[PDB]
Design a protein around this nucleic acid. Sequence first.
RNA 1: GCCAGCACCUUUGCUGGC
RNA 2: CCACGUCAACAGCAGUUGGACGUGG
RNA 3: UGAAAAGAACUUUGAAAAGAGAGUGAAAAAGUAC
RNA 4: AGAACGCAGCGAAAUGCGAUACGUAAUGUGAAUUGCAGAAUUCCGUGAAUCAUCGAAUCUUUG
Lengths: 83, 490, 153, 60, 127, 269, 37, 69, 21, 53, 84
Amino acid sequence: LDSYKVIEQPITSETAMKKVEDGNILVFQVSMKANKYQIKKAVKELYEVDVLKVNTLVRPNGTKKAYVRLTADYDALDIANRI
Amino acid sequence: MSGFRLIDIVKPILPILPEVELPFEKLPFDDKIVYTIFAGLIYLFAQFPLVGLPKATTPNVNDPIYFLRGVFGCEPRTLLEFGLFPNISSGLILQLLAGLKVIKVNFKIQSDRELFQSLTKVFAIVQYVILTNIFIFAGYFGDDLSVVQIGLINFQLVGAGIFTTLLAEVIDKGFGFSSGAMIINTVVIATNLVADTFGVSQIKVGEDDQTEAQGALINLIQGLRSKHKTFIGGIISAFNRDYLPNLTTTIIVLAIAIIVCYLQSVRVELPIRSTRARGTNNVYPIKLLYTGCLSVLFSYTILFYIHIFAFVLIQLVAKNEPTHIICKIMGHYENANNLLAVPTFPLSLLAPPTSFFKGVTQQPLTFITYSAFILVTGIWFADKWQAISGSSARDVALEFKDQGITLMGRREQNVAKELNKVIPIAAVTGASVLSLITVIGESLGLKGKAAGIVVGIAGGFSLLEVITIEYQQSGGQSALNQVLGVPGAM
Amino acid sequence: MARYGATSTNPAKSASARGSYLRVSFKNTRETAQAINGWELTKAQKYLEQVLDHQRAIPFRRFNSSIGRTAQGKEFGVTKARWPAKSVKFVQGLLQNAAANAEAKGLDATKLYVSHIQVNQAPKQRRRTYRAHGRINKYESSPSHIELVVTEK
Amino acid sequence: LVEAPVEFVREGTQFLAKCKKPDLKEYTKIVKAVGIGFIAVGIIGYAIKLIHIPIRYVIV
Amino acid sequence: MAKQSLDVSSDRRKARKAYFTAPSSQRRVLLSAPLSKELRAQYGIKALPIRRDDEVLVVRGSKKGQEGKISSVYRLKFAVQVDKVTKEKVNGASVPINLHPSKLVITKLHLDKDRKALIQRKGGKLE
Amino acid sequence: MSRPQVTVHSLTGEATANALPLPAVFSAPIRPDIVHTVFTSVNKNKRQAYAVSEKAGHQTSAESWGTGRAVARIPRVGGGGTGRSGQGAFGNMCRGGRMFAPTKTWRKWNVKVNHNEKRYATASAIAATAVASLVLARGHRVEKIPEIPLVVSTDLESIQKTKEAVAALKAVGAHSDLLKVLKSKKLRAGKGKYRNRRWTQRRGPLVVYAEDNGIVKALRNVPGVETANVASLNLLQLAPGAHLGRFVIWTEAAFTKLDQVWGSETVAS
Amino acid sequence: MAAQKSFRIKQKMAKAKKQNRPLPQWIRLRTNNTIRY
Amino acid sequence: MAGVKAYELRTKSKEQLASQLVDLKKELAELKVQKLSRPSLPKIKTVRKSIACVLTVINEQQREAVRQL
Amino acid sequence: RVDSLVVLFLSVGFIFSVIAL
Amino acid sequence: MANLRTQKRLAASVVGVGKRKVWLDPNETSEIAQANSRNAIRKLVKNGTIVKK
Amino acid sequence: TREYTINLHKRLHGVSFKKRAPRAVKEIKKFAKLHMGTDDVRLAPELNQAIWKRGVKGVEYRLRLRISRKRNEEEDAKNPLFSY
RNA sequence: GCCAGCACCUUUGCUGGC
RNA sequence: CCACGUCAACAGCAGUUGGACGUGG
RNA sequence: UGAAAAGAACUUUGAAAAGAGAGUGAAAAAGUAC
RNA sequence: AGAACGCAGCGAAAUGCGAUACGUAAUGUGAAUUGCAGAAUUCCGUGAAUCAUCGAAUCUUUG
């Protein structure tokens, strides 16, 4: 059974925290093998969501930044007071 | 003036009075102690009476108010009858607005932090002038007049009150030691203590309250002991009598003093680790009752203000004859059928029941509602205190965390998340339990200061604990001379 | 460890100062050190302060290499004035420390005479100067450590 | 009584359980602190009353 | 120290075997200090691996006659701090002082239930 | 009724009777050149060394691809670069590397042992223990007179006990000589300790018996005593360092066991 | 030049530049620290 | 019973242990990052590597069971 | 800026004014 | 002005210019230096403390 | 005030070289130092514009200058050196 | 989105042109 | 690169400055 | 370097570095490529 | 056989192991371990080892 955890950690930074404010967007750092679908699924089962866009790119941390927009009804403030 | 411009700011009239502004020069250490005692010597002239000859003569002013006296930092029949009460109140109003989050202000920015403070001392003077009209509407002086000398007495009280706010400022900005609000609170509760207990006695008769007997400590102990220069003797232990027991005020001041001065010596210990070692380190206690000091000062203050249920602003509408939207439905402050007459039935069950007497067991219902209100107001002002900066729980935990993690490299980490769990349990509930033992301190007996004395000493040894830690650990003039000397490095 | 090296003082009639690993010439500060001299601190100070304006530098005895042909002074047993104000700043920094250590002393006041001063090779900074066909010559950027001691006479 | 105030109250009873309980040497600190307060009490309250009595004496 | 002979390392390698080989329970050998004559009689032994709560007096140093509980002892360094002296610098900049176990004699023991049983049940060489 | 005949001396001892003759093998002129030559021959066979390493050269590819500029190629070498190399290194000329032959092994030394030369070597050595005055010169002290070189009992084998060694040593007097060996000069040898050099203790006496050895478990150990047999013994034991005239102790039965040989080699002078 | 394509090779070198040593100091106090970097 | 390694852990069956393990991993994932905090804690290290240590146990039991059949 | 002296002078003169009247 | 390499660059960036044209007031130079943010320099522009040539 | 015409016929046709202007500014600074009897001489950007307008080559010969004083003395000397 | 005017301390609001 | 904080070394002098040093993005 | 880091507290001076005096230790011309 | 790159609370230097990431385990020992700052665990029987196991469950990427 050959799968991996996707999320290694959430990234919190000056721009990352601002994304939460702007449009309910968390941003994560996910494995180097991470695929788009498994990020969508993982965030669902750790925060009770539906994701309204996943897009991913490299960072010099090596771990792949993953920019995840989330539903309006979710509330990203009090569930980021829970991470 | 009007003209045509879009304004609603009071801007030409504001410099045309002559309020005040504040220091100017300061010096330590010798200069600070001389100036802080000097400030308390100008206060000490509370023995001179206020102007007004018809009130001063035959009625001698109405009966003394032993409820306002401690939180105000006043004394009736003198220059300083309002004390800190409007200065603290302007702080309550802006604590309420910024703590209800109707007006949002970020206080770690320079610009609007200074704005808050300047606005407080302007609104202190606005509160002062409405208070001075409030007190003559209360009917305290025993003469309510049309515009003549009742205008002049109210003017004088504001002018001596702009002085007491200027003293509060002067000490605070470093002319004297401590904060000037803290000092005037502590010297008023102090005046009351030896006036009652050491006192002096004088022979007179009087239907009204007169100071025939003061010196409860002298009268009790020397009557118990032997005979003196005075011819006395025999023990008066306790009574329910109109003639005072003399033991009653002697025990209750001590009873208050022991229990809240040990609550003041209750701290929550939170350990920190390694000294340059391996293993545990300091026990570091934190000061709950200096944090809750201003919370329960605000709590005690608000019980005297409220129009719906309080002393000051209901005594006006009790005095005021016309019945409309405002009426003495708020509370009846009038003569009573009862042996001792104080408000017969008000909505002021927020009014504490104690006096310079024994506690009241005869109404448990007013006790429960009083206790409940001040615990609720204690946690109300607790969450306002956290919200309106200070050492902010969100900011300090976050700020130390990123700062330390990246302080070149790198660093190993902190006890500030270990603090983070236990500080809210200590802070909110420590304001609440301070409020609970404030009403217990009142219920033992005495008034004119009973909740003002408990907070005054409570924040005083917790302030002392801060200053001793800064003395011994941080350095300078020090407290480590008593014991320290030898720690170890592994 | 270090100083004097001409040990006679003794410290109840002395003040002392030292520079350490400062980046100002070995070659020109030995000449300044030999020339301070001697002279109380105020004479040493206001030769060096006037030097910044106009009054040379300070006589050069042995490091007197050409140069053009020279000149106006002073030139009081020398004839080859130059103007390194680099070494003037170094010795002014030495003197102010020396005069402030000689203000807690409590000794004073006519006395003085700069009794020994010696300059130590801190080392030479070593850098390079471009020329021809990938071959590069040495460039020293001259620096020094120094020691100063004064005594009552 | 629901989940949030039951959680807060059993957290806040751990502060009240965690009292630093009387030490004789900190009761010595209390006695001197209160007694430094009691001599300050003594000069301030004595001064106010004594000179008030001649105001009453002088003016009928 | 160690007994002769099998391995014929002359040799600074033999010193390195003491220095770098053998964590805690063959530092038990090098953290031993002789017993007295009263507590030698009591348990029948000779020497004992140190406890952090055994009390020990210094015999062979320039600090050669002080008692004290052992405040720490280090496995990598085979060396004992004794509580304390220390030696202050005036603001509480503070000093260890370290020692060697075979330059000490242990006075009072804290010795423990099955700790003393294993030691008195044959030694070796069961590791 | 006398010739080389000797008086027996026991370790009980405090003697009573008489011994067997002192050997005819104990005569021969004492010859120090042969004694020294045999001593160096035997110690060489064991001897070898270690030195520096890398390679025993030669990291370091070359032929002599020296590159001119000035002062030449000096003389040599090549490979190569910002190091290391110059020469260098590959030397010698070394301010880094090897020497002009890294201790060689290689370098066959030896002396092989001829049958005739070995039995001459032992015979001369046995005749070099038979002196008296050279004992003091070597650097060990004997108070007791005469009975020399010393002769002891068969009871020497059985011990075992530590205290009966002390009882043996009082008799031979001696005694003080072995106390010298447990005394600083004993001290601390430096870097020369590994291969033995040393700093700076002296030797002691040699005890020899016959049927045995004996060399039993307890006879090994003691400050500076050595223990040997008449069947197998050598010049390292009979005069360590080759400065003849060791203090030698013997035991009865030595004469008769030594006397019978074949082989063939016998006294002449 | 041509390798086994690819964006991925660039990415692992990009991490390596950060994870680079650089730098500090506090372990050099407690070692055995024979000068390096 | 009261915690959490090693004699409780090692002989436990096993669905219970897996369910507990993912919710001790939710404590650490709530407390990541950062939220690391600043900490270390020794609890964060121990439970991170108790996930490691007892994922050896679960995968070991599966491995050894497969060699009994 | 006003002065710490000005507040001191103001108050003592205020005390002297009030007492008689 | 001192350390206003960054505030020449940032002030120029928000008005979209090559950095020569943008102007900073001499009197309120301290208050321009207390910007550091891209919505802080919006306030300064509207006041007229930063203008554009 | 006082008004002086500084004689830049002297030496300021004889220099160049290439670099008249920075020498010329220094020459005005110590000429005005001598005339006014002062320490610092202000040198406004009015005068800096005045000498660099025609540009080195490139000076409008003698220049009139208006100069004020001084009695301050040392602490914050006022020598305006433009137009007063 | 860009430019200009009035109101506002700013964040803003109204009007006109491209 | 960008942002913030610094001057021991590096910059062909010097420094309140940097492409350097330190830390984040 | 030293048995043990005891790797130099405190005070004055200096933009800082450092210097002066003082502390530790058996020894500091044993003060850190010692 | 070997090698790339990761892993950590820290990460200068060394080698310990693989996304479970100096891990731990089965035999086993006894008062101190996590190099250190710091954050903690233990201390009259379940913390802590290569003192010894050519012994072991996990095992990315490349060869």
